[PDB]
Amino acid sequence: MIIDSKTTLPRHSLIHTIKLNSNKKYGPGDMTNGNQFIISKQEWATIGAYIQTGLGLPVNEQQLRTHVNLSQDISIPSDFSQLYDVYCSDKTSAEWWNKNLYPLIIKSANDIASYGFKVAGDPSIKKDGYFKKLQDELDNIVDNNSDDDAIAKAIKDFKARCGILIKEAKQYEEAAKNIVTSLDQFLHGDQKKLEGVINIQKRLKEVQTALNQAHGESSPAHKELLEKVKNLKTTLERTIKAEQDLEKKVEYSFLLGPLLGFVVYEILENTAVQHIKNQIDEIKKQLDSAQHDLDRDVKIIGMLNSINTDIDNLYSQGQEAIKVFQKLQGIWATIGAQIENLRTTSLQEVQDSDDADEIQIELEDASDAWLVVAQEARDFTLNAYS
């Protein structure tokens, strides 16, 4: 979904920091995916635009006419009726993703933020986080001025506080796994009533082949204009996926129209996108001269070709997203495992050694590492499309 910059970008330093921190005990681990945060603002913003196009698909002739601005005087050949069932299926898939998948991504970022801010606290507020409170209990365990009831009480308190962190990490692990399960249903169906992206892609390709053969090659102008639209979609895809840092809250624009699809609104400032917009306007003007069938065929089949490009992205990104959230699932599993270690094995050697200084510094360093990922997760949610 992202074409990496050929030059190092300032945001790469922050990602590098998370990587350098990824081996610190009690820390958040490797919450990256290449040069992206593990929950990627640009990736989900881009996928969201494909979804927005799916949400707006027409499902009958009246809607198709309105959608592509087709003159009422133009007849639609009967084999274009192949489109309506497939577009209905794609629209239903986009609605399912928008209802059942995308909200979970936001919630997953909020889980990272919640845990990170809970363990690290907020020193500006003089509000100790859990890790500072664990540090203070270790002081109580090893303080030579503590009586036996006080030591037993601090051991019990330390274990209970770790227990809460373990319980919450388990919740977040199961939540990441639920995203994996939901992505799998998105791609491959629920074997109930939901048709998966894989089958929608297959049907969109079949309709694409059928209508391009029957109506996409009806004249030299048909081939030339549908090729121009394909080339603009290719250029749009390269421009949209270029690695960049989005500065604005994510919004969507249909200014390019149905020949190309929705884009992230911030990308309209981009000069190359403005050039594509101008070229689409020229194709439109070319279709408003020209016989009714060229007008009709390029608008409908041009859009169909771009929808097929979109679904190819939805399938590929979904498979990659499964891998990313399975990594995050495993990260939460390892987080919970290390806290269980901390309150059993590590706490026992603190008692046996009467020495907690090293573990206290590990918890300090883990807090700082959690603040890095917590702020990136917060920045994802604050900027994500509603």
Distance (Å, rounded) from C-alpha 333 to C-alpha 340?
Answer: 11
Distance (Å, rounded) from C-alpha 380 to C-alpha 121?
Answer: 20
Q: Do residues 28 and 169 lie in contact, with contact meaning Cβ atoms separated by under 8 Å?
A: no
Distance (Å, rounded) from C-alpha 211 to C-alpha 213?
Answer: 5
Q: Do residues 119 and 374 lie in contact, with contact meaning Cβ atoms separated by under 8 Å?
A: no
Q: Which residue has the tokens 């959230």?
A: 325
Q: Do residues 263 and 240 lie in contact, with contact meaning Cβ atoms separated by under 8 Å?
A: yes
Number of other residues whose CB lies within 10 A of the CB of residue 255: 14
Q: Which residue has the tokens 């890095």?
A: 372
- Phi then psi for residue 59, to 5 deg, are -125, 10
Please report, in angstroms and rounded to a whole number, the separation of the first and last CA atoms in the chain.
Answer: 21
Q: Do residues 42 and 317 lie in contact, with contact meaning Cβ atoms separated by under 8 Å?
A: no
DSSP-derived letter for residue 60 is: S
Give the burial string for 230-242 (b: 16+ CB within 10 Å, else e): eebbebbbebbbe
The coordinates were experimentally obtained by: X-ray
Structure tokens at 361: 């510094």
Distance (Å, rounded) from C-alpha 217 to C-alpha 287?
Answer: 16
Distance (Å, rounded) from C-alpha 76 to C-alpha 63?
Answer: 13
Q: Do residues 113 and 378 lie in contact, with contact meaning Cβ atoms separated by under 8 Å?
A: yes
Number of other residues whose CB lies within 10 A of the CB of residue 8: 10
- Phi then psi for residue 33, to 5 deg, are -145, 95
User: Domain count of the chain?
Assistant: 1
Which residues are 253's β-sheet partners? 263
Q: Which residue has the tokens 């996108």?
A: 273
Distance (Å, rounded) from C-alpha 186 to C-alpha 177?
Answer: 14
User: Exposed/middle/buried for 62, CB within 10 Å: 0-12, 13-18, 19+?
Assistant: exposed
How distant is the alpha carbon of residue 158 from its chain centre?
Answer: 36
Q: Do residues 110 and 224 lie in contact, with contact meaning Cβ atoms separated by under 8 Å?
A: no
Which residues are 33's β-sheet partners? 36
Query: Contacts by 378-381 with C-beta closer than 8 Å and gap 24+?
Result: 378/109, 378/113, 379/41, 380/37, 380/39, 380/40, 380/41, 380/44, 380/106, 380/109, 381/106, 381/109, 381/110, 381/113
In this structure, are strands 32-33 and 36-37 parallel, antiparallel, or unpaired? antiparallel
How distant is the alpha carbon of residue 386 from its chain centre?
Answer: 13
Q: Tell me, what amino acid is at 326?
A: Q
Number of other residues whose CB lies within 10 A of the CB of residue 149: 8
How distant is the alpha carbon of residue 56 from its chain centre?
Answer: 20
Q: Tell me, what amino acid is at 222?
A: H
Q: Which residue has the tokens 């194709």?
A: 283
Q: Which domain holds residue 328?
A: 1-386
Number of other residues whose CB lies within 10 A of the CB of residue 144: 5
What does each C-alpha distance from 181 to 55, 91, 306, 343 come to in angstroms?
A: 22, 21, 28, 32
Q: CA angle 251-252-255, nearest 5°? A: 140
Distance (Å, rounded) from C-alpha 369 to C-alpha 301?
Answer: 51
Nearest to 278 by CA among 257, 253, 252, 250: 257
Q: Tell me, what amino acid is at 227?
A: E
Q: Which residue has the tokens 């309209």?
A: 268
- Phi then psi for residue 203, to 5 deg, are -75, -40
Alpha helix (H) ranges present in the chain? 11-21, 41-55, 61-68, 82-100, 102-120, 130-142, 148-188, 197-215, 220-241, 271-288, 292-341, 347-353, 357-383
